[PDB]
Amino acid sequence: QTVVVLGSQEGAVHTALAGALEAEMDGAKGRLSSGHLKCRLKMDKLRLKGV
Amino acid sequence: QTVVVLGSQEGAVHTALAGALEAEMDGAKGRLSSGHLKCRLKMDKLRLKGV
Amino acid sequence: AVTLPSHSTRKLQTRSQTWLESREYTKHLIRVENWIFRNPGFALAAAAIAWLLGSSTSQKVIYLVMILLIAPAYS
Amino acid sequence: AVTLPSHSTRKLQTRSQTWLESREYTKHLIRVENWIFRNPGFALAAAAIAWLLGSSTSQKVIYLVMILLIAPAYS
């Protein structure tokens, strides 16, 4: 009996990654693209500057 | 728009290879394991050497 | 090393475009069509099978889908 | 880059042991079982579906197999 290693599965985890969303500059500061949220917005004080 | 490469799918073709039979020393001389055949065998001339 | 979980079974129904949908929402069709183009007579195999189940002339095609859709992937 | 052709669909029925059968003749079972363990309520989904087709109390389980066996892979 011998052993084989099956190399690297980098592209394999890629094709298995078919639902993730990619993300960028990561540093200690990891940025990512779209994601929504709920924002209560109030026009408490907006003067129109020149009526 | 950008592009990704999806790396290497070496292990992917491995897991897709779930029915093949492996084969060895290949050179210009490729050896492989089991495979059957049909052999008509004749006892035309076999002397028993020492009856 | 079966990389089992095709993540599409855990889709994120979110506005930005997902990882590889471009080829994904055709890959299973090309799967089944390639497989049957390679194993044609399995067509009438499935036919004789299904025509013997259901006995409805309407569930018959349903069992045709059954057979022609177990054959490609799980094989 | 769907490495489509799982070669087991082109098995060589030859005496020496094939490439990765050891895990292969369990991989689809672990596939379906993992998938259903992750998506349980799909059980009774398939149940209500199949119980509405066939109308035989014997083809019912057949359509149960239908649904529970399209769901894992082609998804």
Residue written as tokens 């035989």?
Answer: D56
Q: List Cβ neighbours of D63 (8 Å cut-off, separation of 6 or more).
A: C62, C66, D49, D50, D53, D54
Per CB-CB distance under 8 Å, the chain A contacts of B8 are: 7-12
Instruction: Name subunits touching D (3+ CB pairs < 8 A).
Output: A, B, C
Q: Resolution in angstroms for this experimental structure?
A: 4.8
Q: Does residue C75 sit at the B interface (CB-CB below 8 Å)?
A: no
Secondary structure, 3-state, C9-64: HHCCCCCCCCCCHHHHHHHHHHHHHHHHHHCCCHHHHHHHHHCCCCCCCCHHHHHH
Strands B31-32 and A23-24: unpaired
Buried b (16+ CB within 10 A) or exposed e, A4-31: eeeeebebbebbbbbbeeeeeeeeeeee
Question: What one-letter code names the amino acid at D58?
Answer: S
Backbone angles phi, psi at A31, to 5 degrees: -100, 150
Q: Where are the domains of chain D?
A: 1-75
Q: List Cβ neighbours of B34 (8 Å cut-off, separation of 6 or more).
A: B21, D14, D15, D16
Q: Which two tokens stand for residue C28?
A: 């299973």
Of A18, A16, B16, nearest to D3 (Cα)? B16
User: Could you give the C-alpha distances from B21 to A43, B16, B33, D4, in angstroms and in order?
Assistant: 72, 13, 8, 18
Separation CA B41–CA B44 (nearest Å): 9
Separation CA A40–CA C22 (nearest Å): 36
Separation CA C39–CA D8 (nearest Å): 13
Separation CA D75–CA D64 (nearest Å): 17
DSSP-based three-state secondary structure for C6:
coil
Q: Phi/psi class of residue B7: alpha, beta or left (left: φ > 0; alpha: ψ in -120 to 50)? A: left
Experimental method: cryo-EM
Separation CA A26–CA A32 (nearest Å): 9
Separation CA A44–CA A35 (nearest Å): 27
What's the fold here for domain D1-75?
Helicase, Ruva Protein; domain 3 (1.10.8)
Chain C positions touching chain D (beta carbons under 8 Å): 2, 4-6, 8-10, 23, 27-28, 30-31, 34-35, 38-39, 53-54, 59, 62-63, 65-66, 69-70, 72-75
Give me the DSSP letters along B1-51: ---------HHHHHHT-TT---EE--SSS-EE-----------SS---S--
Closest residue, chain D, to C64 (C-alpha)? D66
